[PDB]
Chains A and B, each alone.
Chain A
Amino acid sequence: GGIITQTPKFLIGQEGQKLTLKCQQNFNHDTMYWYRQDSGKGLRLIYYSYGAGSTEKGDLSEGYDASREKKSSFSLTVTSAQKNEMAVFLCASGSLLDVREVFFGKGTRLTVVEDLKNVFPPEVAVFEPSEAEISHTQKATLVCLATGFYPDHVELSWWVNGKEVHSGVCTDPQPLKEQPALNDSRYALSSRLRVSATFWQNPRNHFRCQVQFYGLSENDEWTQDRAKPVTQIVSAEAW
């Protein structure tokens, strides 16, 4: 009866920066873990705890530190970030009395960027369904475009009048680098929503394509002339 939640979901960093992440567990679990996922290799323990405050190093411990402040919270700190680094981090918690009760967080995704100025919010527009498909198909398709955002820390969703929808939605798994260098390149997202023509027939229906961007924090005060790339949502309004 709980969740275990890592925060933050998405992390932006600069080389040599120090990044700290938290795990929240409500299951009354004594044991807690921090794991790293490196693609194609499988999970490796970094640090673990039997309570607060305790920490036992994972086979990947060095370069990181962790603190168990309390029973319910476990923190991992990355002592210095590495340029061009991208990583995923996972919190799990365990029961002392059941080795098999283990639960995992949804993960924290980290992108280190050498220059912060580079970060950009997404630009979103929706393209209305073509006439040809409709007569031909009887099926009406709407496309959402997210362009020019770095890093790729976005969530994209389609909202019909009122509500989020998943039926008839296809979003690409993979973003694209507009200008591969590759070091700091911007990326774009494809998404398609399809509805019966009759449905889209009266553009008295509202379909919204909206993207949530995770960026800067007030704390990371910014110089650059143009507007701060803060965590924000950008949408397209269509009928």
Chain B
Amino acid sequence: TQVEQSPQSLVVRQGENSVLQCNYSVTPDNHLRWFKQDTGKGLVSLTVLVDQKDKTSNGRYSATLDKDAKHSTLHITATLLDDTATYICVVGDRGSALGRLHFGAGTQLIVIPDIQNPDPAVYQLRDSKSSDKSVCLFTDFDSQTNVSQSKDSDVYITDKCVLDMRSMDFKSNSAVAWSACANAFNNSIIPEDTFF
């Protein structure tokens, strides 16, 4: 309420640069600082800005502050997948330890992979050790493709996840379903090549 960040959520393509915003009303404003919180995790300090007009960078992170405008921006350069986690703008009202910190709601960043070699396939994997217990997975599609959650009581579909095979420099989307593998995913959109 006294610290505002937008957009509520931001989507960016990997390698692109993204920009996040904090505007605030608190007085006094000794400093502004940015945090990254991974889900299931705590806050990590990215950069801290003290001056009336200031700039700082920590690695691939850059922020500027205009105290006059009561405004700040954070820059992430050449965004990686790891950068998805929520970003928080905090303002401290004193320059001594007597002060209090004013916290923004945060902006959630979702970073999406750039595939450019999509080979869409879905396979059934026999699940051992023995009893199947076999799941059907749709994989290697591309970002535009979005899986839609099945409106079905019996049937289970995972939302899409991206894994990066570092040292092969390869990334793939994937989704899983269980409870029909050929007719397992339908809905908003499906890929026509759909190998089997």
- B-binding residues in A (CB < 8 A): 31, 35, 40-45, 90, 92, 94-100, 102, 104-107, 109, 125-130, 132-133, 136-137, 139, 141-143, 145, 167-174, 176, 178, 188, 190, 192-196, 236-238
- With contact pairs A90-B42, A106-B41, A170-B174 given, residues A143 and B125 touching in the complex (Cβ less than 8 Å): yes
Main secondary structure of the interface of A (DSSP, over half): strand
Contacts of B101 in A (CB 8 A): 43, 102
- Cβ contacts A to B, 26 pairs, < 8 Å: A42-B88, A42-B103, A92-B43, A94-B97, A99-B99, A100-B48, A106-B41, A127-B127, A127-B133, A128-B128, A130-B125, A133-B123, A136-B195, A137-B140, A141-B139, A141-B174, A142-B125, A145-B135, A145-B178, A167-B166, A167-B167, A168-B166, A173-B39, A192-B137, A196-B168, A236-B129
Question: Does B159 sit within 8 A of A, measured CB to CB?
Answer: yes
* B1-43 residues at the A interface, CB under 8 angstroms: 3, 30-31, 33, 35, 39-43
User: B164 at interface (Cβ–Cβ under 8 A)?
Assistant: yes
Interface: B180 (CB within 8 A): no
When distances are taken between beta carbons in the complex, the residues of chain A under 8 Å from B39 are 173
CA of A188 to CA of B101, assembled, Å: 38
Question: Measured between alpha carbons, how far is A92 from B103 in the docked complex, in Å?
Answer: 13
Chain B residues within 8 Å of A168, by CB: 163-166
Return B85 CB to nearest CB of chain A, in Å.
Answer: 11
- Could you say which of B95, B127, B166, B196 contacts A132, with CB atoms under 8 Å apart? B196
Within 8 A of A (CB), among B163-179: 163-168, 170, 172, 174, 176, 178
**Complex formed: what's the CA distance from A204 to B33 in Å?**
51
In the docked arrangement, what's the CA distance between A142 and B127, Å?
9
Q: Which of B134, B165, B195 contacts A194 (CB 8 A)?
A: B165
